Amino acid sequence: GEEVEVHNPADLPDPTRIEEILEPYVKLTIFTPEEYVGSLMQLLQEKRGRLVNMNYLPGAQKRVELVYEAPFAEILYDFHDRLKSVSRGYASMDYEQAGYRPGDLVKVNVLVHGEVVDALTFIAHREKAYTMARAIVDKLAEVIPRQLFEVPIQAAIGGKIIARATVKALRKDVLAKCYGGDVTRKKKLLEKQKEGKKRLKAIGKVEVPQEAFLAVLS
Amino acid sequence: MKVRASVKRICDKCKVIRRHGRVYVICENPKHKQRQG
Amino acid sequence: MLMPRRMKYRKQQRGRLKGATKGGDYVAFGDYGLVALEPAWITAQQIEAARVAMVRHFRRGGKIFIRIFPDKPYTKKPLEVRMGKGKGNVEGYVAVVKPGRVMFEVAGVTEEQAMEALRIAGHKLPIKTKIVRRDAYDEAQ
């Protein structure tokens, strides 16, 4: 049967036995003046709204009304602002719920240092999710606590990573008193360090700070 | 302005001139304006 | 990138870089060629970068003749190491090119395609070069 992937994209049913993930869609009507229409349609395209209908209320001459079925999530921040800006303010909007619908959606998992961070599991449309993952991976890179070992940051569409970033690798300048000249003495200290980073990489459980979550989730 | 060692036409509306020793490109597209340097 | 499949000797002395090229001075297989104007050890990585550049330019069509082969091993001491303790390790292979040598030839390709692929390819090599077109003089050779 059916039920709702609720306030937890992580808490799915097992995408093993699955066949339809449903977005909420919405009946979206746009009262533009003139042929800002051209702008408007490009906007609703990348918002993945199907164009169902358009009608001219003639008289002078501008006035066009556009009807769209668009994923409910694809408004919600961003849209209203961009409706207003590409139309110098003259575009209006109204909508009502108009049900649910199948969507080609992917589960994108985010693992830091090999461990899946559930708190950052989301869900997107395969046309966009890379660009979504290409983004979080890099913002997470800039706010994760730099460790004693280099920390990988990754995003996977089920068992296949698609976007990769790496945190350093805080290290000790082990060669600081090395004005001998003999390269063997630099190698000795360099080997030991390389071996240790392996060891700290393998057993190194990094935790994401609650200050990083807020930084990625603004 | 694009200040480079190798200044060249970028589009066919680009035009190549010599100016104060350095080679210049001027064009109706300001992105293509280059002087050598 | 090219290296010999086997060698009698692993290391060999640097030699001099004198004279015009001994042979390979006439277009022999294609319609256009790139010829060297100065001597150099052209490395394999360079040859590979020139090949690929012209390939990319012939994404559909074309034959590329690479007429120089990097058979001379290139030696380098390990870094931060004093002089002595034997000759460096092989870290690569080079091809000895003297001026007049035909290094690459293209065929099956319009004149514009040929002189553009060879122009990029020149930009990948450490030497000045000249683009040439098969002559009656090549045929006579």
Added chain:
Amino acid sequence: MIQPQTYLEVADNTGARKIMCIRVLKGSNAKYATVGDVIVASVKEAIPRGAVKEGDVVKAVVVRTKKEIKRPDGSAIRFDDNAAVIINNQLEPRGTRVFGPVARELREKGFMKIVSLAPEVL
């Protein structure tokens, strides 16, 4: 004449009892803070269940100082303590009562809310 390290009495009901100045918010390298200047400060002592607690980093306006301030009429005024009221980014008190006299300079420097809450403006 407050500078980092200096302890101020907090003259409000926010719960702080002592704060230590960690920076005077006036220019890029100001040496000192006087009446009506803003400091960043660490809460060093507080009463339980207050609004601010020990360890918090707060903003505050100096409200009295022990070094006398000189006035353009030719007079000067001096207090027995260096004291402050904790404020927010809008320069508004975070408490609802201010205690003790405060200096008249707070009015021009834009702390009217504090000036009225005070029991005396000298």
Added chain:
RNA sequence: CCUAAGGUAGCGAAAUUCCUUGUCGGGUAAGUUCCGACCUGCACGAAAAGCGUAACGACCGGAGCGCUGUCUCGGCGAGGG
């Protein structure tokens, strides 16, 4: 598989831990030091004693209070030069 036998108790990033500012927790507005913990002990370990221990120490760390020209930051004054 090998050994004469394969390090017990206790202790452990230590006057020992290299990698290393290990990790976690405390203390600080902020702590490569310090304290508590963990155990991956490069390379603790039982009279070259192991783990503790009240008292004692011009021994060496870490924190706070008090008080200060140490300092912000320098001024003045005295005497012997």
Added chain:
RNA sequence: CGAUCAACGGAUAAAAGUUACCCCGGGGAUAACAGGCUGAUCUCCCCCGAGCGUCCACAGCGGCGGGGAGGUUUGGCACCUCGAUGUCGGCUCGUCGCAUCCUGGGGCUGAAGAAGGUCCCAAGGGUUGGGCUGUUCGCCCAUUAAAGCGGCACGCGAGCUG
């Protein structure tokens, strides 16, 4: 005829270590500091235009390869100094370069504005206070127009610290 007298022209028939408790004669014939020469390495700048950038090689980027500059890194070499050229870091006092951190002037922008990005000019002045650690660095706290980077024997011990 007895020699791995193999350190193979073969010192004794017969021989290992250690010195931070060290000593003398010598050497800048020879290392460590700094200088120098060099510039692999390092920093910076270019050439080429493959690939990003919804569209678009060049707003911002720049595969593979190619050319240089600098002389701040680690080095190579062993040229003056071993009848001595005192080390790192700090404090103090600076002064210089500019590959500019801020401030002044511009061009381009994927520059509406404001605010950015990027490159060009520009060295007059300015470029904070703290926690940790000997640290230079760096990380953190609180600010700031900014919290520049380098040279001066990695400026500066007949100036101090230690």
Added chain:
RNA sequence: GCCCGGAUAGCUCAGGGUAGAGCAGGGGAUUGAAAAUCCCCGUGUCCUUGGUUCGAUUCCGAGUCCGGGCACCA
């Protein structure tokens, strides 16, 4: 970035004449019904995109990525 390779089913994987197996499942056999065991069965757009071939997972490109080398990395 680089040298070696390595991206094949929901997962872990064997490999120039269109590629399978364990596994997860769904169903079935066994049972009184389960557990365990066993049988049966898929969508592979052989990672993405382009080209090479009469025939490409294979070969040539490019793109993103994974495991080990160097290198940046108080």
Added chain:
RNA sequence: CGCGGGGUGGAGCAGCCUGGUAGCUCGUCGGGCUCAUAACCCGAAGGUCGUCGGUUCAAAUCCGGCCCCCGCAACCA
């Protein structure tokens, strides 16, 4: 990097001073015992010896290249 050792059925080890021969224990598989499982008993398979090259009539063996693993060393500044 320098020195020394090593890489052989699925695992852990012989064999190589030494050229012609691959062995031990466990594991796996087929059969027995048992009501059944293990233990135990009988029988069998599985190694071209890391990889390329050389020497040889003949290479696990001897010699060299390359790859990887282990131990030791890297000091006076």
